[PDB]
């Protein structure tokens, strides 16, 4: 809800089982690989954000929350050193974990698509007034500058 | 109601008995044929949507819900590869399952008819503010481009 | 009331005793004759609507409801094949079934009369905001094009 | 909340364990050093405010409150004798004491940064209407005139 | 609060221990000296108001109330015979009696200072809408015409 | 309060002990003298109002009510035969009967003074919206035409 | 109160003791004389209204009601045959029956006086919004055309 | 233009060559037949208006004016004795006398059609604000009650 | 300009050299073929509109006017018998006859495209307020129902 | 000015001397190279737009107009096949051809930078209301997706 | 005036006699020294802006224009590499070249002072609506970060 | 008039005959004494403003302008080192040089008096919208802090 | 007219023949007596204003102007030492010098009378917007405090 109560990615206490991906870094497994080791809210180190090797168009990233909550809004950031940013994407939400739905608003009578940002210092937010009763959220970035890299930060009620 | 709580067609758990039609694909039966096998909310495969062979003007498609609910609004999509879209249609609603009524609004003092869409990327919605206490809903498309094909998605309260 | 809860004429379960008229088709009786056999909400067949032989000016049609309810609004349609429509009429309402009253509004400081429609596709409604606590309703059409024929559809609260 | 109920730094009863820093004045310890001895709300003496020797860009100052409260607003002052003031900074807030978050508002669709002040007599406040449910607050001053020196004063609900 | 319920200085029943000062008139003590003997709301006699010998810039005057109350507003007067008035001052408020805070408003984004008055007949009030939950109040007059002399009159809720 | 419930001076049942003055008519006493004998709300006789011999500037007139009430508003009249009216005055109110306070409003940022009237037929009222929780009320007329004479009439809630 | 619930003068059941006057018609008594015998709300007969012989300026007419009620408003009429009407008057109200008060409004900052009427057919009313908690009401007509004659009609809540 | 300056059909001075039709009454000619003999603005006689024998759908009636003028608005009437009125029609205008154009407005984003009237006493006008620079005007009535009969009356600027 | 002064296609006096196309009907030439023989504003006959054989996406149709004029607005129609309508198109304009420009509006901050119509009876106009100083105009229909067929009608100032 | 009168790049009549660049394609010269041969308003062929080999940050492109005119607004497009678009740029204008100025608006109290577009179909315009009296205009694109490619189109008054 | 017509410092054609200063770089003279050699609107080289050695508080810089013009507005920039910016200053204007006046606005009822900027990328302008008929303009910067350095740019009408 | 065109006191070219006073500094004369030698718009030196020895209440200072002009507005300043400011004064204006008039405004229905200032840095102006057609202007300061000292600056049209 | 152009009474150049009165001071004449010798706009001396011996109710004072002008507005003052002021008066104006008219406004639907003032310091003006084309003006003061004394000051256009 319209409040300042974001999630806790910088804490790191969350197990890597929730952050599921498909980018084996050292053929260790298939569940996770990058997890929250080098992709947190402002974390100094080698990897400032989550990088991507293969140019996968239908990219996804599971985000398992603690329970079902009303998510509204999401921050936007970039990547230091090598500037990287997205251009087009779409939010998703599910419940039974056996489908994939696209986020559509009421004031969009055309093929409008979310923007995002274009600078690491910019903080172009997207206030989602329509309450969304869901839990899992994913992003389908259709384009990017060089590589997908953004320090996401969902907002819970 | 004005919320984001659509049905679950992509799940596929619903039995094909609810999705009744009259288009025998391989003379298997008369109840259903295409069902939700190749007609869901974004499903990659051979059949991206529900096709139609015979040019049936008075087309219908039973949609049996779980129970009586207040339906308001409906999404609009197209078909990939071969672009297809409707032009005119009319929503229906019943209760005793022994009649067929047409959807008429209060701010329509003429022979106005719903539009729909004209592009797979477009998402021209139709916010139906007037609450409709019903369960079964059908569509009577009077025209089309080449063949009837649209990934419908009702909205429940 | 301002809602979408019309009556059920297409069902046909209602007995013909309620739909009383005075047009013996085959000298069978005097109570009813045409009833809801060829006059329902969109019913394919020979008689698309209720026809009239004699040019009766003071025409009436009893409509016995289930119980006393607040009626507000009424749909308007025409007749296929042979276009037919009314021009002037007046709504009535009673209680003790031993009188006949005319419908008069508050914002009518003259001899104004309801219109109706002039096309089978048109749906010129008449939103009657003033609540009317009654049960039986009749119409007194003073004119017509060739023959009285309209698929009425009262609205209950 | 929008009220006049600031903290109590001038009292001095608070122990130096809360005011943690990293500026050993006489190699006494590492926890605190300057504490509230020469940095209070208007305190006559040698040190009118908290000075800084090394030009540390990522400066921080722990402020442990009594309990979790809704902080909103903050005063701004300068330094006597030698005029000193900041130019850019960012408010932070945490809960589990194992992360660091940046303060972002809803009406900031760009890389906007808080100002502060530029005179010891000026009192340019920053009314933070959005409630912030937190406890620990820190500042990340990115620039200054000569040395970081400001008599801060948080506001609790 | 916005009401007409001022304190009772003209009564004189209050003991001189509350009105603390530092102006020995006849080296009698250090606690009080002038008290409410020649400084009340319109009191005919020798001393029409409270005079000041030494030109003390950081002047103070303790005002111990009965209990903690919401003070809002304060009257302004002058001195007869020899016209005297202030120019700049600042209201203060404390609780633990071990600090001194300055009064700052929300609609003051600069180094604004209260005015006061400039005539014994004038009654330029200062409606302080923001509730102030305090008890002890003092004034820090930075300037004056010849000598500090004003018949103050706090307003309690 | 804003109502029509004035006091009862014309009744005369009130004892003269309440109406205290200092104008011995026949050296009878010092408490009262004129009382409500020749000064009431429209009373035909010799003395149409309360006259004054000595030109006393700091004139007062005790008005002891039944109990503490919220007084708001006051009528204004003149004197027949010999026209007399005031020009400047000030309302007062007390509680402990051991002080004297002046009436000051919130919308008076100057040395404004009440007017009154200037004709026996005129009825220039002064609606005092700010509630005044008091009991005793007095007037300090600073000027007059020839002699102080006015048929006052307080208003109680 | 603003309603249509006038008194009952036309009934005549009220005893003549309430309608007190001072106009002996046949030296019968001093209490009443004309009473409601020839002065009611539209009463055909000899005396259409209440006449007056002597040109009494300070005219009065006691009107004893059943109990204390909130009176608001009063009708105005004339006299048939010989047209008669007033020009100036004043309403009065009392409680203890031992005084006489004049009716003064809040929006009258001058010597304004009520009008009344100037035609038997006219019905110039005077909506008295300010509630008046009283019982006895009288009129002090200061002028007239030839003789005082008006069919009054108080309004009770 | 918005003024009261209609044409002169009742005068009859205009020759029948302008009023061209195709309804030989007595096989006299082909140019005109009924002309303005029994079709004028209120003309008592046998033919109250212009009748029509054959049920011609694409009916036309040439109206040659004196010169090119700005026509705006048109009256609407009926027929006495036997009530007759139209239902749908369309205005036309040309210049070179070698084409036929239909009248379309700017605020008609659908298949709207002009109404007309439905009573000889009614005078439902159609204020055509958009100036129309033309001369010849015709009507294409698509429907009627029994026979086409209306006393038209163009309006010139 | 916002007026009713369309072109003259129904006249037919224009030579076929202006209406240039590339659809040889009987290998007669390459300049024109269909011209205004079976494509005019409502012309009864075999060809009700201009048909198209090959499914040419980048379709064009030269329209040489008399001189340079300010064109604003354009009508929209359909085709009888076999219903046909467009879906997407774009207006063009040139001057030197050696280029091709696309029509872009000021209130279109996206990839918006003109609609057109979807019924022969509908008249969905497109009021082009922005003046366009040009002469030649063409259309680039990107889609259609079955075949391109529309009775265009430009509007000149 | 706010009108539809763009330049003429598609004509090609302009000599290559005006379009100056610094990208020798075949070491032919230093003045121009790509010119308007493969970079015009929608020109089918090999090069759909102007490509760039070296990743030059301070890119420039001289645009010599016919004379000094008031330029306002500019279109935005993309590149087919390989999608390419800019992210940040700045407009410039000069007069004496011996300097370079940056375009700054009045409603930009920060480091705001123009956007542009992000799709070949999009037409995100930038209405520059402030008149700019200049002739030569250049762009300083600071970023891009892969290569600088955009079909610019200035707007003259 | 509110237009885009700045001066021409980047041209360099202006002689150094106009840009008078008092900072001998190599004891060459006293008139000028730095001039427009290393202080222009964006000029790549060693000196990006005008530096200052001595910490002169009452700094001045003569700016002789071509003639008397109405100056309104002024741009604000910073310095690359080493960030430098001002904090307080005051605009001046003269005519006879024998005095120095300070710039005071009408909506400044206090000791307000202009700000400027605090970033090389920021462009915080100061729209001076009040016309100023003058020629010579100077700045009196009272403070700075390290050294005075700003690429000024006056605006002429 | 509302413009920035003050007089020229800093120039000093004006002869001392215009600045007439009555404060012989060294018994040199009676016309002038201090003149514009140590009283100009910001002039560094011994006397920062015009001082006053004797406490003259009815102080005056002739200001002979070049000719009759419309004066509107006046600046307000203080004195450095020793802070001095006025409290009450009144503007005057004459024509025949044989009288003295006081400045009275239209929106002053009381004994209001101009304020001035109370700080050398403050610039509390007094916009005099009412045009004043005069030439000579003087001030009658009724009070001051210690000595009359203010750097006046009239404003001419 | 609404401007600052009063008459010139302080000059004294006007002859005493214009200021006609009827108060022989030393039986010198009958025309004038007090004239402008001791009654001017602020004139120090014995007589601060014009006194009156006999209590003349119908007082008059001729004021012969230079010519006919539009008079609007008039100042109001008092008398020093002995405070004196009026209460009621009426302005007059004539032309042929053979009559006397009273000043009546349009927004006075009652017996309203001008007030004036009640303090020498007050300046209660009376803006007379209605233009008055006259020359001679007089005042008819009906009341006063002790003696008629006021320093009048007419306002000419």
Curated annotation (Swiss-Prot), chains A, B, C, D, E, F, G, H, I, J, K, L, M:
Location(s), subcellular: Secreted; Cell membrane
Membrane topology: Peripheral membrane protein
Main subcellular location: secreted
MF GO annotations: phosphatidylinositol-3,4-bisphosphate binding; phosphatidylserine binding; protein-containing complex binding
Domain of life: Eukaryota
GO terms, biological process: cell adhesion; eye development; protein homooligomerization; retina layer formation; visual perception
Tissue expression per record: Restricted to the retina (at protein level). Detected in the inner segment of the photoreceptors, the inner nuclear layer, the inner plexiform layer and the ganglion cell layer (at protein level). At the macula, expressed in both the outer and inner nuclear layers and in the inner plexiform layer (at protein level). Detected in retina. Detected only within the photoreceptor cell layer, most prominently within the inner segments of the photoreceptors. Undetectable in the inner plexiform layers and the inner nuclear layer.
Effect of residue 145 to Q: In XLRS1; decreases protein stability; does not abrogate oligomerization or secretion
GO CC annotations on file: external side of plasma membrane; extracellular space; neuron to neuron synapse; photoreceptor inner segment; protein-containing complex
Alphabetical UniProt keywords: Cell adhesion, Cell membrane, Disease variant, Disulfide bond, Lipid-binding, Membrane, Secreted, Sensory transduction, Signal, Vision
Subunit details: Homooctamer of 4 homodimers; disulfide-linked. The homooctamer has a flat, cogwheel structure with a diameter of about 14 nm. Two stacked octamers can assemble to form a hexadecamer.
Its biological purpose: Binds negatively charged membrane lipids, such as phosphatidylserine and phosphoinositides. May play a role in cell-cell adhesion processes in the retina, via homomeric interaction between octamers present on the surface of two neighboring cells. Required for normal structure and function of the retina.
Name of the molecule in the record: Retinoschisin
Organism, as annotated: Homo sapiens
